[PDB]
Amino acid sequence: GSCASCPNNCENGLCTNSCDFEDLLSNCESLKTSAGCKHELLKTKCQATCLCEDKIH
């Protein structure tokens, strides 16, 4: 059924995960405040926290 491939994310039957980036480190949100997503370091392991955000406005 719908949401079958993404039961934890379904705004209306569609998955909400469209980010092609992933945070290699779980401290990306923490490193961002201590560094910055624009920072080159976050640009390699925190590409999703900088280039994406699990949510695009």
UniProtKB/Swiss-Prot annotation:
Tissue specificity of this protein? Testis.
**What range(s) does the ShKT domain occupy?**
19-52
Disulphide bond pairs:
3-10, 6-15, 19-52, 28-46, 37-50
List the subcellular locations.
Answer: Secreted
The UniProt similarity line reads: Belongs to the CRISP family.
Function of the molecule: May regulate some ion channels' activity and thereby regulate calcium fluxes during sperm capacitation.
Q: Give the quaternary structure.
A: Interacts with NSUN4 isoform 3.
Record-given protein name: Cysteine-rich secretory protein 2
| Gene source species | Mus musculus (Mouse)
**This protein's encoding gene:** Crisp2
